[PDB]
Write a protein that binds this DNA or RNA. Structure first.
Length: 180
DNA sequence: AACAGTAGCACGCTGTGTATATAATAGTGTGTTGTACAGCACAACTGCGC
């Protein structure tokens, strides 16, 4: 082994606590998009940490694109400050990470059909529909996308340890189904 | 007759469908409920006439 998964995307939610006028928000923000007809939220962005926020009239906000939990909270506080600077009585509350995505490379090809047959109740593999095997782990409850190349995607985690836990648990199985 | 330029065709590369999680919230679609409108031979009935 020796491989440890790399975090790729962190999704979080934040309650600003006050109602927002989206045209005002979009108008005053330096990096905003807002087309009511397409989606009901201002799509705001900041350069550091590089992230994207979906800002709603209710004052709720979704922050995505961060590569670390630190970066997620940091960028979230920053978006909240922007809203304040524009003039609303916003508050940075209820910061919570909802989804963590990770990925790695085991460095060997995998026999997906064998794995799907062996771990049938957790696996779903339809190569004509999507080339990767969808593995639904029980403990921890994580979803893994397994590819012939040996590249692995882990998602559905609320905490970093779950990403790490799942990979540790899957590695022996990937080894059992290697090609070379 | 030869050379240069322009147009057309073919090939290669980049971008967007499929799948995973996860939050946000008002809309859109579907289903259900309510209201309104549109071959014998003999056996029995029944029908007609006295």
């Amino acid at each position: 082994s020796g491989i440890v998964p790399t975090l790729q995307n962190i999704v979080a939610t934040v309650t600003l606590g006050c109602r927002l006028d989206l045209k005002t928000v979009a108008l005053h923000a330096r990096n905003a998009e807002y087309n009511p007809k397409r989606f009901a939220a201002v799509i705001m962005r900041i350069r550091e940490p590089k992230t994207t926020a979906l800002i709603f009239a209710s004052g709720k906000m979704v922050v995505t694109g961060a590569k670390s939990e630190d970066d997620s909270k940091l960028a979230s506080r920053k978006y909240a400050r922007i809203i304040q600077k524009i003039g609303f009585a916003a508050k940075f509350t209820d910061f919570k990470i909802q989804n963590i995505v990770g990925s790695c490379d085991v460095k060997f090809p995998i026999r997906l059909e064998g794995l799907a047959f062996s771990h049938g109740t957790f696996s779903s593999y339809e190569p004509e529909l999507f080339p990767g095997l969808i593995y639904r782990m029980v403990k921890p409850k994580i979803v893994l996308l397994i590819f012939v190349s040996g590249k692995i995607v882990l998602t559905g985690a609320k905490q970093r340890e779950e990403i790490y836990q799942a990979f540790e648990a899957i590695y022996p199985v990937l080894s059992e189904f290697r090609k070379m």
